[PDB]
Amino acid sequence: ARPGMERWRDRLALVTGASGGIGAAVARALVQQGLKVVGCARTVGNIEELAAECKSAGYPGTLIPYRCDLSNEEDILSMFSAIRSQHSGVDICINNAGLARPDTLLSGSTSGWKDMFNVNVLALSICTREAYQSMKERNVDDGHIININSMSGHRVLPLSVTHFYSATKYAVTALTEGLRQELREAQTHIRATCISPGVVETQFAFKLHDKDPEKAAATYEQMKCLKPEDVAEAVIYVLSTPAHIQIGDIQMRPTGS
Amino acid sequence: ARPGMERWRDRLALVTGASGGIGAAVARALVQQGLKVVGCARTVGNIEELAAECKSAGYPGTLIPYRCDLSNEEDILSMFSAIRSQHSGVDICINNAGLARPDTLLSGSTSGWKDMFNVNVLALSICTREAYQSMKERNVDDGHIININSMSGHRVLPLSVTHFYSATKYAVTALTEGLRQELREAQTHIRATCISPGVVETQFAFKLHDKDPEKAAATYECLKPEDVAEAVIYVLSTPAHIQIGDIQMRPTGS
Amino acid sequence: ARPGMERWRDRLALVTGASGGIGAAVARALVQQGLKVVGCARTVGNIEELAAECKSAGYPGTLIPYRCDLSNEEDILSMFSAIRSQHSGVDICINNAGLARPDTLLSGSTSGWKDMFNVNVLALSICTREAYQSMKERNVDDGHIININSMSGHRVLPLSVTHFYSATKYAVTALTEGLRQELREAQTHIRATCISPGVVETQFAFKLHMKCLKPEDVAEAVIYVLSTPAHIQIGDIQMRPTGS
Amino acid sequence: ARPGMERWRDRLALVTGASGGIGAAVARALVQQGLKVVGCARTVGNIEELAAECKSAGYPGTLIPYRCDLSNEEDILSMFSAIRSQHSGVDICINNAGLARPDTLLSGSTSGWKDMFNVNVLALSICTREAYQSMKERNVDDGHIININSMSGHRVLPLSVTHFYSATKYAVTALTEGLRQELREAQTHIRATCISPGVVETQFAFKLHDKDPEKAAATYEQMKCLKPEDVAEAVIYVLSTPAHIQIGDIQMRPTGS
């Protein structure tokens, strides 16, 4: 394993939105590094497929698929309860699931705004709380919570269909800093970090533009983009840092963008 | 009327959360300046009370009380419908209603997080959308949307009970900038501004510390609600070609 | 007088870069409101002409021209010494003098970088310091220091020729906040404020003969800030043209 | 070499402020990874000793000490001239030299403010420009400029003795972002990054608190601060990223700080 990842061997990571994109790349990378990974999403079949690939590849870690709709609070609580009932717990929580719906501020549907909040902010916060509560009861003083933010959490770009999304990522910027603060107040060494990528070639733009597949291809064919593996490598760097270092944010963009 | 406020005479402002605090002060100030103000909240009796006082004092504007629970979208849609069919439409929207519940990130209730989002962000966005649509249908090119933000929309203070609240105000910071961009894309001269106060002596802290009113009293024993209303007047009074983006304000020496 | 300006009557405001543009508008507005204003710049002819215009209009205040090159610290200290001697001290400091030079990060001149720092940051900090020390020695507890910043002090626009200038305005954003902090630490009610306008019409453009702010718009924001009751501290006013 | 550092082998990095602290650690790390490093500062004897340590360790890279007072532009120009004539040019520029003097906004000496500007902002900008021009003349399209920023370049802490220093670091935040935009406009793949640490255990606090060395020791004893090697490891991560990735900022603090 990568230098600095030894101490995480066999410890359990949760990766939300592991059925594709960034989350699948992060899950793959943690399993390559010898972690037990619970990966969750709606499209559980993709996670099972990834786990089978990890097993065929001979990786030291294990990917454990779990079906969970993050828009459903009980689904999340049930997942954490299932982990607890099994005498286990999450030591690393990667809050990766997220989405944009093309609901502008001047004419957007309230349902799309709610959907963005439900996953990007509320589910991220419920997972953060439940992961922390499990660490606490297990006397884990050195776990790590990593939120997948965005450059859109730091500046608002003049694309109307992502304005509300950008506002949810601004919330993630503030939540990650507030989290760091509460973990200090609780007198722990549990770490909190954001990773803030620019455009990454995943299914994200295809879901945003679900009524205009061509507009989604052009986000990606026309621009140099990051790859989900690049974000996964940033997560590996953050986890591999020794315990007294707390990476607050890594802002990353495609070169020349 | 204050210089710059003449052009707003008899035009309609919606002020959300007008039943106390900053909202009540903004409503009273706009009525003093000759506007028609629809003031909404759940506690409609207070807003009615502010109307008899406004009226007793012989002010030039009018306060129209309206009962609306902003946590219910259908209630908000009904309100805009009544404004459009009874008062023509809305030219100024002051998104003032907001709250903090003491739900920390490490142990807070999801219900509290949802409640803060529902009023501070969702209702603010629904009202923005409907006010804009009202202006669009009446070919109003010079309306104004003013979001009541907070210094907590620009920095995260180490007070665990207001972390989630702060995150909703960061969302307000981003939405107000997004709004400006959309209004420019729409080729309008409609203006979008936030006002970002530090501590204001209202009922806000008493509600946040509902289980510890002594802590709420310590907060204040600050800016006054009238102070924020004066910032709203300055913003509206500015020439049409000026778009104030934000006014950050704190008590002196705080 | 505008409501809230009464308490500033006959008190002294220093307005740096008063010979045109924002500074001249700010000086005129404060004179109209009955302040004693010291307006400085490298050459005083325009400030003399403004003072004569104010006197002809019957304004209640007075404008006092002072020649000062803000790139020379000794010139600045001499200006404060003169103000202390002849007019008691400074109660309001408007740090308005500023400049942008088109010295890019990849190819710019060091002389241009230094000039921008010298005026935008160092002179502003020297004036801030001397103004505070003036208030302190007179037990003035309610003075006001106002820095004229820029929207470039809050975001970096992809225009190469203003990047270094933008970095100096980010510095001013940080200094204004640090100043607030120090004034609170000193147990005073002296106020500190930034005004951050975007595209303002330049004197250049004006002389040559909405998509722009006018100098008067910035002066009106200064009047709003000063007019706030003493317990209110405006930290920043960000403003841009509606049509920008 | 570390995965990703191979493409930098035998290429030349300039590390300013290499006579101690973070810059000495960065210079050592780059020499370990096989680069040619020009390390400069006023206290050139320290850099000679570091070069001797690196040679003694049998590291693949080489450290070239160079005496340069960064407050003197002619000194910097002569250094770049020497690098050009003797070592072709600069492909990586680490703008590390920096200082804080305890000159508060209300009563500070102007000389302290000018000293902070001269090194933290002016020297950093001069070295950036000359490093870019060095790349340009050699048709280098993949260099890297890394500025050592600070968390104080992102928030103003209520410590009066560091207010002006914080303002110099806000300038670095803005300069790094403007540098990215110019390198993009120049149609290059030259990368621009800053690293923004919280408290790092170096001589920095001792120099800031030159009249109260007890205050400097209290800083480093109250908690397990960042070490210079931790910042060097962040620099190695940034350099090791494939060329299409452009890290914009890494914000890092001591855990629990």
Ligand SMILES: NC(=O)c1ccc[n+]([C@@H]2O[C@H](COP(=O)([O-])OP(=O)(O)OC[C@H]3O[C@@H](n4cnc5c(N)ncnc54)[C@H](OP(=O)(O)O)[C@@H]3O)[C@@H](O)[C@H]2O)c1
């Ligand atoms: N791609 C980019 O340009 C970009 C840039 C910056 C940041 N980000 C952030 O990166 C993170 C990952 O997105 P991505 O780019 O990998 O997009 P993606 O390919 O669309 O993947 C999103 C993942 O989130 C999961 N998800 C969405 N809604 C869910 C729900 N209700 N319940 C459970 N899982 C749900 C999806 O799985 P199921 O549909 O199977 O549930 C999928 O696994 C997001 O937070 C996004 O904001 C992306």
Ligand SMILES: NC(=O)c1ccc[n+]([C@@H]2O[C@H](COP(=O)([O-])OP(=O)(O)OC[C@H]3O[C@@H](n4cnc5c(N)ncnc54)[C@H](OP(=O)(O)O)[C@@H]3O)[C@@H](O)[C@H]2O)c1
């Ligand atoms: N006070 C401060 O320290 C402070 C500082 C910075 C910013 N702010 C912001 O200022 C704004 C106003 O707050 P305030 O200080 O005036 O607090 P406040 O005294 O508690 O008043 C809040 C108002 O919002 C209304 N409101 C809350 N939930 C509502 C709902 N579901 N439907 C309709 N109305 C609702 C309330 O009326 P009903 O209960 O009758 O519905 C009340 O009139 C908020 O956005 C707040 O975040 C306050």
Ligand SMILES: NC(=O)c1ccc[n+]([C@@H]2O[C@H](COP(=O)([O-])OP(=O)(O)OC[C@H]3O[C@@H](n4cnc5c(N)ncnc54)[C@H](OP(=O)(O)O)[C@@H]3O)[C@@H](O)[C@H]2O)c1
């Ligand atoms: N114009 C804009 O688009 C804009 C936008 C945002 C912020 N701002 C800021 O607003 C402030 C005023 O700018 P402006 O538009 O009014 O520009 P301006 O017309 O160029 O005014 C600059 C003023 O500063 C004075 N000045 C410059 N260097 C000086 C020095 N060495 N010593 C003494 N005085 C000096 C000039 O007078 P002398 O040359 O006679 O000495 C002049 O009175 C500056 O801080 C600027 O950065 C301007």
Ligand SMILES: NC(=O)c1ccc[n+]([C@@H]2O[C@H](COP(=O)([O-])OP(=O)(O)OC[C@H]3O[C@@H](n4cnc5c(N)ncnc54)[C@H](OP(=O)(O)O)[C@@H]3O)[C@@H](O)[C@H]2O)c1
């Ligand atoms: N230490 C921290 O808590 C901390 C936190 C955040 C960021 N930083 C940043 O990290 C960077 C490195 O600082 P450090 O902590 O390593 O401090 P340090 O131990 O004091 O080292 C500073 C280095 O800068 C060099 N330098 C100073 N003035 C110079 C000049 N005129 N010409 C040439 N070199 C000069 C010094 O060498 P000579 O004296 O031999 O010339 C020394 O090598 C700085 O930019 C600092 O702002 C430090």
